[PDB]
Amino acid sequence: MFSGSIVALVTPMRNDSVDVHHLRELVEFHIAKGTHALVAAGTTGEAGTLSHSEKLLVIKTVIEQAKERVPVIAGTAMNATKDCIELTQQAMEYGAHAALIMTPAYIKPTQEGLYLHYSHIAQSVAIPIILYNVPGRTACDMLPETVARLAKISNIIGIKEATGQMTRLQQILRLCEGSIDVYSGDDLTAAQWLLSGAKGVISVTANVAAKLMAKMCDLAMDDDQAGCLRIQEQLMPLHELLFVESNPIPVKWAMKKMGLIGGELRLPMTELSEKHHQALEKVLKNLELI
Amino acid sequence: MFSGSIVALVTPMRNDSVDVHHLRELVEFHIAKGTHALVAAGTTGEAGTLSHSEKLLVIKTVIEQAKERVPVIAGTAMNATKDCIELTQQAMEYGAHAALIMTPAYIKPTQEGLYLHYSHIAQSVAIPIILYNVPGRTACDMLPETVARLAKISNIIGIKEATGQMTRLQQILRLCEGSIDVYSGDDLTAAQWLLSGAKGVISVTANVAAKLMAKMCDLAMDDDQAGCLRIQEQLMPLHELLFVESNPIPVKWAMKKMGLIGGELRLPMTELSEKHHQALEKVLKNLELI
Ligand SMILES: [Cl-]
Numbered sequence: 001m002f003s004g005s006i007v008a009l010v011t012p013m014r015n016d017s018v019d020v021h022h023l024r025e026l027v028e029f030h031i032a033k034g035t036h037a038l039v040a041a042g043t044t045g046e047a048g049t050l051s052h053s054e055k056l057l058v059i060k061t062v063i064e065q066a067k068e069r070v071p072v073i074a075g076t077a078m079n080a081t082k083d084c085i086e087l088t089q090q091a092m093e094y095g096a097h098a099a100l101i102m103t104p105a106y107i108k109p110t111q112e113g114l115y116l117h118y119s120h121i122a123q124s125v126a127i128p129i130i131l132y133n134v135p136g137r138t139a140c141d142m143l144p145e146t147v148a149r150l151a152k153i154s155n156i157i158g159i160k161e162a163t164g165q166m167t168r169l170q171q172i173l174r175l176c177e178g179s180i181d182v183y184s185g186d187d188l189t190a191a192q193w194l195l196s197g198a199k200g201v202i203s204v205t206a207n208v209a210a211k212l213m214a215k216m217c218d219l220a221m222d223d224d225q226a227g228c229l230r231i232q233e234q235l236m237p238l239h240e241l242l243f244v245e246s247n248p249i250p251v252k253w254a255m256k257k258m259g260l261i262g263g264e265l266r267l268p269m270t271e272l273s274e275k276h277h278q279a280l281e282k283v284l285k286n287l288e289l290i
Numbered sequence: 291m292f293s294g295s296i297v298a299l300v301t302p303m304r305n306d307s308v309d310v311h312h313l314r315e316l317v318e319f320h321i322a323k324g325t326h327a328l329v330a331a332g333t334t335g336e337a338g339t340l341s342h343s344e345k346l347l348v349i350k351t352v353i354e355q356a357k358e359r360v361p362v363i364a365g366t367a368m369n370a371t372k373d374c375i376e377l378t379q380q381a382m383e384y385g386a387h388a389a390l391i392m393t394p395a396y397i398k399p400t401q402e403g404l405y406l407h408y409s410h411i412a413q414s415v416a417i418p419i420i421l422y423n424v425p426g427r428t429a430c431d432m433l434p435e436t437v438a439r440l441a442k443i444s445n446i447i448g449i450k451e452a453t454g455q456m457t458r459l460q461q462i463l464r465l466c467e468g469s470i471d472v473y474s475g476d477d478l479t480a481a482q483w484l485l486s487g488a489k490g491v492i493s494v495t496a497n498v499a500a501k502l503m504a505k506m507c508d509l510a511m512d513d514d515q516a517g518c519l520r521i522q523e524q525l526m527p528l529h530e531l532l533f534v535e536s537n538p539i540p541v542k543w544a545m546k547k548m549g550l551i552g553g554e555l556r557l558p559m560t561e562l563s564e565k566h567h568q569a570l571e572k573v574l575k576n577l578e579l580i
């Protein structure tokens with residue numbers, strides 16, 4: 001349903017309120033740069049500290065500004081199944097084209113509990129759903145067998161798989177045989193995944209290098225393996241630096257430096273440590289982004 | 291400020307709402323069995339899937355029923371520092387004796403961001419605070435160096451350190467030299483911790499074996515290593531089974547078997563798989579709890 005470079009948008013903030021002005025500008029930037037879809041209120045968008053109202057404001061802002069020029073995916077995870085259904089229902093009603101649903105965090109449901117969670121959400125809300133597995137943050141790993149069961153629920157169209165593990169990508173494809181799209185959720189390994197059966201990448205780097213990310217994905221879609229890997233190597237110093245502290249700390253600093261946003265983070269997230277500024281400015285300059 | 295066996299209370303549920311009747315019975319049960327303090331709305335209380343309203347109802351219920359006969363600690367973690375300040379303030383206003391504050395989950399702040407988080411909470415709300423570190427759930431490990439800085443903020447009284455790693459208890463004690471109390475957050479290693487400088491255990495097993503946990507802790511406090519270890523070895527088969535699926539799935543099953551609660555869990559948490567029932571029932575019988 002989606003492909004290519006899908007940006008996990010930061011949520012611009014100004015004096016601890018959502019910076020609608022800059023968020024709208026980012027939608028126009030991505031449309032101009034040829035990003036293939038937008039994710040609103042994902043992890044890179046500080047979903048973990050935004051209130052329910054703010055998540056909805058961010059989703060609505062992006063959808064309204066896009067004016068059907070580029071698809072919009074809404075992050076709608078909540079730990080309780082009943083809460084996730086309500087948030088996913090409002091994102092659907094706002095016009096989101098799909099819901100990206102991270103697993104519950106911290107509470108560590110069983111595989112059974114994950115199946116019940118997503119199957120209840122999909123039965124309750126008539127919107128395409130992209131599963132999102134990121135055990136390195138949630139302490140919950142969705143196993144490939146669970147993935148294959150959920151692929152039989154027809155509104156479950158995709159999985160953003162952030163583990164960076166090639167054997168994980170290959171076990172899901174082996175078990176599902178096309179019955180679910182896999183999107184990389186790890187910029188550092190995205191090109192290998194796009195060349196090995198993944199449909200796209202839900203990307204942090206695309207916030208900063210949108211054109212190059214779109215190009216890299218387009219070359220992979222054109223089976224230009226050498227071309228794709230060429231651009232991946234060009235990005236790799238930027239990919240590494242964007243996780244030097246927890247995302248979205250580095251990306252906000254880079255976008256700050258580029259003049260795209262104020263670069264504010266809501267506590268307990270903090271602006272990028274001064275020790276990394278030098279290395280990241282150097283990368284941004286080389287890539288001609290500043 | 292606290293010591294001994296401190297129960298992380300389950301939150302009894304009925305019809306997907308807080309079961310205030312059985313929650314009040316549990317408060318009387320602990321007073322009768324001699325539990326040393328009660329934690330309301332912690333991880334064992336399903337804090338991760340309770341709404342804000344529900345958390346305050348559990349905390350208020352516990353405080354009111356206790357009638358100052360036993361101290362009450364309120365779980366008040368939120369990811370965003372400003373929201374944690376609001377919940378912690380409310381708990382303080384309701385009369386909680388301290389607030390148990392887990393780190394942010396899933397967003398993975400830096401250690402500076404954890405110091406800002408807890409220093410701002412402590413600054414803003416005049417209540418004792420017990421830090422709570424559980425990186426196996428939250429993907430955030432608060433390091434001993436950071437704990438030693440926070441111990442210099444005088445309303446930070448304690449840390450519930452849930453790693454179960456003896457070198458971690460040792461390093462806090464070494465860096466802090468008594469400037470902060472350490473509470474075990476891991477029943478499986480709690481006796482060795484109590485015998486090695488920890489002040490108490492914030493316990494899951496105490497929900498089910500409240501009299502034995504209290505005597506195990508009393509014996510540790512009396513410097514009776516053999517008597518303490520003897521009870522810990524009697525409880526060890528129960529400790530093990532209580533984590534066979536994510537807490538509080540097994541403990542709520544055991545409490546159901548004991549007639550103390552209905553044993554309902556909010557999705558995506560699921561009642562204990564049948565394959566564990568026989569082993570856990572045999573243990574409860576073996577301990578004369580059933
Ligand atoms: Cl910003």
Ligand SMILES: [Cl-]
Nearest residue numbers: 134135136163
């Ligand atoms: Cl991960």
Ligand SMILES: [Cl-]
Nearest residue numbers: 189190191192
């Ligand atoms: Cl790659």
Ligand SMILES: [Cl-]
Nearest residue numbers: 302303553554
């Ligand atoms: Cl219950």
Ligand SMILES: [Cl-]
Nearest residue numbers: 424425426453
């Ligand atoms: Cl842990």
Ligand SMILES: [Cl-]
Nearest residue numbers: 479480481482
């Ligand atoms: Cl032990």
Ligand SMILES: [Mg+2]
Nearest residue numbers: 092095096097
């Ligand atoms: Mg629609």
Ligand SMILES: [Mg+2]
Nearest residue numbers: 154156157179
């Ligand atoms: Mg399908």
Ligand SMILES: [Mg+2]
Nearest residue numbers: 382385386387
């Ligand atoms: Mg008071």
Ligand SMILES: [Mg+2]
Nearest residue numbers: 444446447469
């Ligand atoms: Mg002190």
Ligand SMILES: [Mg+2]
Nearest residue numbers: 561562563564
């Ligand atoms: Mg069952």
